[PDB]
Amino acid sequence: LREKAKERNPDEYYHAMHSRKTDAKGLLISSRHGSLSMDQVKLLK
């Protein structure tokens, strides 16, 4: 893992970089399960 970090290319681009998000700490954020519209919430309420 330390080696993978060292040889990382800063210019690597993946289309998925749009969907994935990173935390202020710099660590990747993974959703627990993978918002509700007002119409959906109204039915559930």
Who's near 22: CB < 8 A, 6+ residues apart?
28, 29
Contacts of 23 (CB under 8 A, 6+ apart): 29
**Cα(39)–Cα(45) distance, rounded to whole angstroms?**
10
For another protein, the closer CB: 12 or 39: 12
Between 15 and 25, CB nearer to RNA: 25
Near RNA by CB under 7 A: residue from 35, 43, 44, 45: 35
By the criterion CB under 8 A, which residues form the site for another protein? 2-3, 7, 9-15, 17-18, 20-22, 24, 26
By the criterion CB under 7 A, which residues form the site for RNA? 35-39, 41
